[PDB]
Design a protein around this ligand. Structure first.
Ligand SMILES: [K+]
Ligand SMILES: [K+]
Ligand SMILES: [K+]
Ligand SMILES: [K+]
Ligand SMILES: [K+]
Ligand SMILES: [K+]
Ligand SMILES: [K+]
Ligand SMILES: [K+]
Ligand SMILES: [K+]
Ligand SMILES: [K+]
Ligand SMILES: [Mg+2]
Ligand SMILES: [Mg+2]
Ligand SMILES: [Mg+2]
Ligand SMILES: [Mg+2]
Ligand SMILES: [Mg+2]
Ligand SMILES: [Mg+2]
Ligand SMILES: [Mg+2]
Ligand SMILES: [Mg+2]
Ligand SMILES: [Mg+2]
Ligand SMILES: [Mg+2]
Ligand SMILES: [Mg+2]
Ligand SMILES: [Mg+2]
Ligand SMILES: [Mg+2]
Ligand SMILES: [Mg+2]
Ligand SMILES: [Mg+2]
Ligand SMILES: [Mg+2]
Ligand SMILES: [Mg+2]
Ligand SMILES: [Mg+2]
Ligand SMILES: [Mg+2]
Ligand SMILES: [Mg+2]
Ligand SMILES: [Mg+2]
Ligand SMILES: [Mg+2]
Ligand SMILES: [Mg+2]
Ligand SMILES: [Mg+2]
Ligand SMILES: [Mg+2]
Ligand SMILES: [Mg+2]
Ligand SMILES: [Mg+2]
Ligand SMILES: [Mg+2]
Ligand SMILES: [Mg+2]
Ligand SMILES: [Mg+2]
Ligand SMILES: [Mg+2]
Ligand SMILES: [Mg+2]
Ligand SMILES: [Mg+2]
Ligand SMILES: [Mg+2]
Ligand SMILES: [Mg+2]
Ligand SMILES: [Mg+2]
Ligand SMILES: [Mg+2]
Ligand SMILES: [Mg+2]
Ligand SMILES: [Mg+2]
Ligand SMILES: [Mg+2]
Ligand SMILES: [Mg+2]
Ligand SMILES: [Mg+2]
Ligand SMILES: [Mg+2]
Ligand code: NA
Ligand code: NA
Lengths: 141, 114, 64, 209
RNA sequence: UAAGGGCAGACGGUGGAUGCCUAGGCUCUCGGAGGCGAAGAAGGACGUGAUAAGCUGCGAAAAGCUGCGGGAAUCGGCACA
RNA sequence: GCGGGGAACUGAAACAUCUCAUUACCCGUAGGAGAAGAAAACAAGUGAUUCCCUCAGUAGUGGCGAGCGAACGGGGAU
RNA sequence: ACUGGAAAGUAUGGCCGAAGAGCAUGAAAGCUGCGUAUCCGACAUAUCCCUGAGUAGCGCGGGACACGAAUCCUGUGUGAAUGGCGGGGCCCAUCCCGUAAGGCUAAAUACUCCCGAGAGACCGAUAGUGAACCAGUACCGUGAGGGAAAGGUGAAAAGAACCUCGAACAGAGGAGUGCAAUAGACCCUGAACCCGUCUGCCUACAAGCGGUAGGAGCGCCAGGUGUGACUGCGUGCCUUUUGCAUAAUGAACCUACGAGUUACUGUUUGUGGCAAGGUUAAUUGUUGACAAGGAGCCGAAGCGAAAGCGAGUCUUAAAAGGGCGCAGUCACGAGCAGUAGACGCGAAACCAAGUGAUCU
RNA sequence: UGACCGAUGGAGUGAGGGCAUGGGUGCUAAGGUCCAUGUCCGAGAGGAGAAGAAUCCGGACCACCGGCUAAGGUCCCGAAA
RNA sequence: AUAUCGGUAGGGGAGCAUUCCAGCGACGUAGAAGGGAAAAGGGCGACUUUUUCUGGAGUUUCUGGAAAAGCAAA
């Protein structure tokens, strides 16, 4: 093609909807609005959370809980991912192949079966047991 | 950009005004009166295309009745005899023969007047 | 401008892993006693938002 | 692919040049080309257009006639769109027509355009040349020797080349562009594409993969 | 018999639509500049021409006065002199 | 630009706290810009002001209603 | 050379190009004019030991801070210290940070009455500024104030000597100019509603939305066209309604004008690019385009109010006894939503600053 | 039959009315009023009943100067004894 | 092949015209746009072609793009 025979992909573009332009279009007259009432007027909007005067659900259910402003959240890395990284080094925590300046926690999802030297901020008990069974090392910092 | 379709807008009215020719008074040339008259006529034309078949069948039946009563039979008796003898000539052909070919109509009548 | 979150909704609702909305149970009568000890149904278990009432809590929490 | 270099006066010097297959020998993406051309034109747009709404007309806000008893239609202020010389409802507003395309999409579109040219055999490679003085007749002679004077031609140069640019400035169906500034619209706008020996290397090293 | 009337065509009238046109608007970009005035401002009044001045310019030295630099045949502002 | 006064219609499906809004408007007074600016600071190491992108519709606040709504940190201009 | 009133048009054939931007010229010009690319040019005139007291702090009443009672401010009443004091969201202790009650300071930021150079998938005379022209004019009002309409002969005025009718150009018919006067001053083009004349056909025994379907005769230019004796059927249209010929609403007619738009943020979907990754924002370089910018955002683990544990987790003394859990991302187009006047016209009113006692 | 059910995008409606049946109310009145079960008008043209929203017959893709029927009819207006 | 194709509110699909833009093709004083008359055409339609008179200088096809994108009633 060139600039004189441009073509988009089939179904990529579509004409917009135009209302109030006659009977043949199927969208004239009342222009998809119905007949009367509040919803047919210019400038109508929905009051969000308004149910006609009944007590709304966000007011009749109770508030619960509190959030911790000093919350430590780790990033879950599993043993199967650790194996995948190990298969094309031994000393792990390279993190350049994945997080970006965060705390990491090793969890037990697959298996290791290979001697690693995994270093991470925190570990699971099953993770440490699996590393020991595979004949590896755990460094926690 | 600013788009106004002056020529197309006027041509649409002029085409319909060409069809409203011959009407009475303002109905021939005054746009909102002429357009109103034209569409009612179109509904009339739709109904009249249906009623034309009824009218022409009634005319054929009346002419056949006259010719058969000349021959000494009524329309209903002639049609009963025709259907019993199983000939498939329709009412338009029978009326055309009755008005223009009386010898052929006489032949049809004599075949079934047994 | 960006859509604003409803403050009461953000204090009353939470999201789960599958995208379901969980909530606390309001009491029928909040004066316990003269109500059967089976009030653990509305006193112990978090419930979910009914599918019919859904999309309203979503619009309250900015369709999240 | 492999291309034969021509000299200034259109003779095959015999030296051959290699173009990257990942640039010049792919299956082009028509939708990518369409998107890139649309983005180029929308970025060229200057949306300086405006009409006056009701709040920016110059008439006063006084009610023209009393509400009841006059016998005509009820009227408010003079700036109403129903009145002659009134407000322009939903007219144009100043606009920014720029939109975003992914970098990989734009790169794929550029490669697709170059591959279209290479497949349709509208790419020719000439030797690098300099002009001692600006000479439109010299540039015209080069174009006629290369047989790209009948239609629109785009020259791709590796460096500034002030004299060459001045020589090519006044000719109608010729355009000049640096190799590192190649874009899909500029490639597609011209019928023929003349690369130089160093331009081939620059395009190959910069727009590969 | 058409007093008059109806329809169509042709040709006119009125009216000023449409098409084509315009430096009069609109929105911006870049660079400057960001004040005038008691040494009398902004904005006005009254004058000023060969022939009445409606604009423009000018101020009783009044469509104007002087010097230096540019330039070379017409000029004596505009509303069909 | 800075400063002195300062509404109401409206929204909350009524309305008084709240909102509209430290808006409209009135008044005073600069400059080519003005204001701010060099820690009795933020924080839980950074290092004067100003402006842009994020943080974030988050922390909070609120007839905890309608609504309002940061800062620290990071990336820049200088 | 051709056409033409007139070539810049067409067709040959040449030439310049650091100049093929443009405007004008009797139609559309690289080579007719002014210009353009490029180069050159200014006599002046401008511009470039000591350490901040009615202080810190405090009581009462208020205000600003995102905050509707920690920080900062103060009307009223009080009132120290010289390592001390202040802050880290009520209050105490430890710790950390800083050094109030004195002042000045460029840059990056906001705006356009004005001057200069440019631009537009902006308007083209009921549009676009109210104002293309005599425009804040005419007109209206005591006043504050409100506020229009109105562009186009022709390339060139060559803007019609003279004749005829007529009291007169009032107007016209000629002559003449001109490509054209049915371009003649209101002058390009010259539509509709509305108003006439001529020609053809019909019409003075006939009765309802005025048409529609049949169908003689007459009349024109070779199968088309005008009219139409006579026959059948037929209570306009819009809106609003359970339901309208309705005696419910609405319109004199024509031409022109007139009402779901745009921005941002969500969400769904059609089509695409990458893909366990996806994508840059402000901004920065080289010349709108290429290149750089990874800050940030989503995804990649969940459960629990939370500490926390983790393909588990919560509840329990303990139990599956029960609850919740064991391919994305970035765009382009489209639908919908919210916030903005948000599809258009229409109140009675409320508030602020002014103008009016020439009437009464 | 085919559209029943899930999940998702977009709605409109939330003034109904007549007839038949079972009832309440009223006066075993109302073209009354309130419910239930069907149906039609609403949103539905065509045929018969002189002319009638919902009574009887019957659900219109378009054309035809073809044929058969439904309700109801066959002396004339008016098709057929 | 069979079936289906009455429709208000309303949902869905596919297109015509208008103004301007890019690319590619064209037309015009041997007569453009506009105005009058006539003729033909389109699964269907919005509309499109052709001839002639007036007019006397601009217009248009195809593909894609963007909207001041269509009136009978307020
Ligand atoms: K300062
Ligand atoms: K010239
Ligand atoms: K003329
Ligand atoms: K002209
Ligand atoms: K005329
Ligand atoms: K008739
Ligand atoms: K009435
Ligand atoms: K007095
Ligand atoms: K009867
Ligand atoms: K009969
Ligand atoms: Mg509909
Ligand atoms: Mg309507
Ligand atoms: Mg309505
Ligand atoms: Mg209603
Ligand atoms: Mg409604
Ligand atoms: Mg309104
Ligand atoms: Mg009308
Ligand atoms: Mg007002
Ligand atoms: Mg206007
Ligand atoms: Mg519009
Ligand atoms: Mg006429
Ligand atoms: Mg003197
Ligand atoms: Mg001199
Ligand atoms: Mg209220
Ligand atoms: Mg000649
Ligand atoms: Mg001309
Ligand atoms: Mg105007
Ligand atoms: Mg006289
Ligand atoms: Mg003429
Ligand atoms: Mg004229
Ligand atoms: Mg009689
Ligand atoms: Mg008679
Ligand atoms: Mg009623
Ligand atoms: Mg009726
Ligand atoms: Mg009414
Ligand atoms: Mg009326
Ligand atoms: Mg009426
Ligand atoms: Mg009207
Ligand atoms: Mg209701
Ligand atoms: Mg109801
Ligand atoms: Mg009733
Ligand atoms: Mg009854
Ligand atoms: Mg209804
Ligand atoms: Mg029905
Ligand atoms: Mg019926
Ligand atoms: Mg029969
Ligand atoms: Mg049907
Ligand atoms: Mg249908
Ligand atoms: Mg002609
Ligand atoms: Mg045009
Ligand atoms: Mg198109
Ligand atoms: Mg419009
Ligand atoms: Mg119109
Ligand atoms: Na007559
Ligand atoms: Na549709």
């Amino acid at each position: 093609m060139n600039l004189s025979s441009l073509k988009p992909a089939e179904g990529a573009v579509k004409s917009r909807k135009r209302i109030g332009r006659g009977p043949g279009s199927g969208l004239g007259g009342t222009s998809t609005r119905g007949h009367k009432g509040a919803k047919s007027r210019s400038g109508y909007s929905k009051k969000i959370g308004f149910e006609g005067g009944q007590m709304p659900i966000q007011r009749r259910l109770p508030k619960f809980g509190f959030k911790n402003i000093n919350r430590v959240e780790y990033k879950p890395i599993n043993l199967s991912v650790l194996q995948t990284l190990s298969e094309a080094s031994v000393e792990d925590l390279i993190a350049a192949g994945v997080s970006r300046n965060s705390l990491v926690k090793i969890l037990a999802n697959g298996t290791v079966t290979t001697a690693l030297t995994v270093e991470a901020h925190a570990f699971s008990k099953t993770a440490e047991e699996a590393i020991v069974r595979a004949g590896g090392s755990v460094v926690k910092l | 950009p600013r788009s106004v379709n002056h020529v197309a807008s006027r041509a649409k009215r002029k085409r319909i005004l060409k069809l409203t020719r011959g009407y009475f008074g303002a109905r021939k040339n005054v746009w909102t009166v002429a357009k109103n008259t034209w569409e009612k006529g179109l509904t009339y034309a739709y109904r009249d295309r249906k009623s034309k078949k009824r009218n022409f069948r009634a005319l054929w039946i009346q002419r056949i009745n006259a010719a058969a009563r000349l021959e000494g039979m009524s329309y209903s008796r002639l049609m009963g005899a025709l259907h019993a003898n199983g000939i498939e000539i329709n009412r338009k052909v029978l009326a055309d023969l009755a008005m223009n070919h009386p010898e052929a109509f006489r032949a049809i009548v004599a075949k079934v007047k047994n | 401008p960006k859509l604003k979150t409803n403050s009461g909704a953000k204090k009353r609702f939470a999201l789960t892993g599958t995208g379901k909305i969980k909530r606390k149970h309001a009491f029928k009568s909040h004066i316990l006693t003269k109500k059967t000890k089976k009030q653990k149904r509305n006193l112990t278990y978090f419930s979910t938002v009914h599918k019919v009432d859904e999309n309203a809590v979503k619009q309250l929490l900015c369709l999240r | 692919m492999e291309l034969s270099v021509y000299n200034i006066k259109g003779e095959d010097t015999g030296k051959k040049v290699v173009l990257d297959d990942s640039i010049f020998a792919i299956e082009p993406n028509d939708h990518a080309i369409y998107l890139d051309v649309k983005q180029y034109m929308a970025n060229q747009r200057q949306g300086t257009h405006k009409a006056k709404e009701r709040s920016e007309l110059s008439g006063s806000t006084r009610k023209l006639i009393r509400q009841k008893g006059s016998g005509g239609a009820r009227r408010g202020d003079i700036n109403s769109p129903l009145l002659s010389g009134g407000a322009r409802v939903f007219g144009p507003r100043p606009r920014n027509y720029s939109f975003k395309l992914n970098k990989k999409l734009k790169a794929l579109a550029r490669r697709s355009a170059l591959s279209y040219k290479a497949k349709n055999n509208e790419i020719i490679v000439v030797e690098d040349f300099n002009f001692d003085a600006p000479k439109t007749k010299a540039f015209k002679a080069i174009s006629a020797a290369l047989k790209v004077g009948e239609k629109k031609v785009l020259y791709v140069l590796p460096e500034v080349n002030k004299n060459v640019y001045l020589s090519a400035r006044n000719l109608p169906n010729t355009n000049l562009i640096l190799a590192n500034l190649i874009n899909t619209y500029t490639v597609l706008a011209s019928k023929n594409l003349v690369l130089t020996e160093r331009s081939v290397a620059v395009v190959n090293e910069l727009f590969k993969a």
